[PDB]
Amino acid sequence: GNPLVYLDVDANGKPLGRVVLELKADVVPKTAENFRALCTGEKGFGYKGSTFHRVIPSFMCQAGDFTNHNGTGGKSIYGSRFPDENFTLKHVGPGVLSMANAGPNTNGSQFFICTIKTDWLDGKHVVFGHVIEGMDVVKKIESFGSKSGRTSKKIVITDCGQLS
Numbered sequence: 156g157n158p159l160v161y162l163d164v165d166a167n168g169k170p171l172g173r174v175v176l177e178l179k180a181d182v183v184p185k186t187a188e189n190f191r192a193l194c195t196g197e198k199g200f201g202y203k204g205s206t207f208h209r210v211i212p213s214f215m216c217q218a219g220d221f222t223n224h225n226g227t228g229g230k231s232i233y234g235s236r237f238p239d240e241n242f243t244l245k246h247v248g249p250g251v252l253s254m255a256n257a258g259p260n261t262n263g264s265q266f267f268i269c270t271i272k273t274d275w276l277d278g279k280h281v282v283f284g285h286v287i288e289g290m291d292v293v294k295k296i297e298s299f300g301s302k303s304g305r306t307s308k309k310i311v312i313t314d315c316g317q318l319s
């Protein structure tokens with residue numbers, strides 16, 4: 156079935172707990188496979204040690220720039236960027252997992268988890284999963300955000316991997 160992956164997240168050196176995500180490989184296999192491998196780190200690189208660099212309360216929490224560590228970078232298992240697979244899944248509510256981008260067909264490794272329904276991103280950002288467990292962790296992360304997106308705590312993915 157669909158992969159289940161996890162992110163263990165710190166805020167200022169103390170553990171917040173674990174976010175578990177289902178990756179919808181049945182709808183978006185390529186996008187799901189990318190996130191899966193970046194979680195395990197099996198290609199030699201991935202999310203372990205990277206940060207949530209942009210967090211905006213009542214919107215979303217953005218992470219995954221493990222190359223430049225500032226929100227301009229990241230890369231996929233396929234190459235630096237890969238196409239928008241499809242826009243079949245929608246940004247329906249809190250807990251939606253979706254790809255950040257710099258316009259059409261520029262998916263890399265950056266992703267976000269919504270804390271509200273973000274319908275205006277439908278057709279622009281590829282939705283590829285959702286939060287199975289650990290929305291409390293997502294809310295903690297959200298609480299350390301700000302209007303500009305700058306975080307008030309250092310939010311790090313200390314460990315990540317595949318559960319099934």
Ligand SMILES: Nc1ccc(CNC(=O)NCC(=O)N2CCC[C@@H]2c2cccc3ccccc23)cc1
Nearest residue numbers: 215217226227228255256257261262263264265267
């Ligand atoms: N591969 C790659 C991906 C992203 C980037 C940098 N691009 C972005 O951060 N773009 C914005 C973006 O993807 N998102 C996800 C929802 C959060 C943010 C976003 C998306 C759409 C509207 C937003 C309005 C205000 C603040 C953030 C907005 C560079 C390289």
